From a paper:
Tpx constitutes part of the bacterial defence system against reactive oxygen species (ROS) and, correspondingly, is upregulated when E. coli is exposed to oxidative stress. Atypical 2-Cys peroxiredoxins are functionally monomeric, in contrast to the typical peroxiredoxins, i.e. the resolving (Cr) and the peroxidasic (Cp) cysteines (C61 and C95, respectively in the case of Tpx) are situated on the same subunit. Tpx contains three cysteine residues, two of which (C61and C95) form the redox active disulphide bond. ypTpx has a regular thioredoxin-like fold: a seven-stranded β-sheet, with β2 and β6 running anti-parallel to the rest, although with an inserted N-terminal β-hairpin (βN1-βN2) absent from other peroxierdoxins.
The crystal belonged to space group P212121 and diffracted to 1.74 Å. The overall oxidised structure, diffracting to a resolution of 1.74 Å and presenting space group P212121, is similar to that of the reduced structure, except for some differences that are mostly confined to the region around the active site (see below). There is a conformational change between the two states, involving the partial unfolding of helices α1 and α2, and a shift of 8.4 Å for C61 and 5.1 Å for C95, respectively, as presented in Figure 4. The two structures superpose well, in particular the core parts, with an r.m.s.d of 0.7 Å over 135 Cα. The binding pocket is mostly hydrophobic with one hydrogen bond proposed between the ME0052 p-hydroxyl to the ypTpx I153 carbonyl, which fits with the chemical shift change for the neighbouring T154 amide.
Numbering used by the authors:
A (entry chain A): -6 to 167
B (entry chain B): 2 to 167
The structure:
């Protein structure tokens, strides 16, 4: 067989509890699957609309907050300031609730995208939370794509309130 | 499919809004604390299903709030403000916040509710949201009032919905 039976199914932690996440996060070398998500004006935005640019897919359970860690904002700012790069902050919050994201608002080349339309992205990117109070939301993950949509960095955070490795994601773009 | 409008723009709505005399289908939606809330948990109480495309707003009409407050104040009556907004964004609703017997419910889970109640917007910019409607249920989940507004921007007939509860 050409598959790994010993790689355990994706599990993340929330409130000290193991939570299942459907699918498999794309790994370095994989070709990222095309997706369509919803922007702040309710228009549909396809991954193909960013052809040639490097993409930082910064995936969150929710970005609907009035207070955030400086590191969240700093990573989005730094990545968005790099040449030929777009940061896509993705969550299940509706576009009406994403505009007040403490870590994305007013940042150059940082776009918020909603899972409102459609959930095929969640399965394709292995970020769908399927158990507990968070079921229906996306897990916390970072996926960096080069100019040709090849994965150059991938991280599914073990604990949902834990920050991903921002230095490693940025290093992949250098 | 039913046809409604958003500021005059045609909007397609899937399913059939329950009419007076129908037995409303059970549902399980998501409360403010991320707990699951079933329609069956309100057995014996009358229910106002106040369905909105979004309740995520910092400014709303006094009529929206007065209706929820008045219906929620009536004995053996609960108001369920339903939308596709996540529970994190449903607490800001002026029309529901701090009102007795008025609770917000999200389609984060149990989304088949949308088709079952004929409020599912399936195509266009509003696809994935609910249309604007009010469905009033008695103690035994029998519909006593229902209204799917033809123009999403206009309010349902609150005086009629309240009259059905009298």
């Amino acid at each position: 067989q050409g598959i790994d039976p010993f790689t355990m199914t994706q599990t993340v932690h929330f409130q000290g509890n193991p939570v299942s996440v459907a699918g498999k996060l794309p790994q370095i070398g994989d070709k990222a699957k095309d997706f369509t998500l919803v922007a702040k004006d309710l228009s549909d935005v396809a991954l193909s609309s960013f052809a040639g640019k490097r993409k930082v897919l910064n995936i969150f359970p929710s970005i609907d907050t009035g207070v955030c860690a400086a590191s969240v904002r700093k990573f989005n700012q730094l990545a968005g300031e790099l040449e030929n790069t777009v940061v896509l902050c993705i969550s299940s919050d509706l576009p009406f609730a994403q505009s007040r994201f403490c870590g994305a608002e007013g940042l150059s080349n940082v776009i918020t995208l909603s899972t409102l339309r459609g959930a095929d992205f969640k399965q394709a990117y292995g970020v769908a939370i399927t158990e507990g109070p968070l079921a229906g939301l996306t897990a916390r993950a970072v996926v960096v794509l080069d100019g040709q949509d090849n994965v150059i960095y991938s991280e599914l955070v073990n604990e949902i309130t834990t920050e991903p490795n921002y230095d490693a994601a940025l290093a992949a773009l250098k």
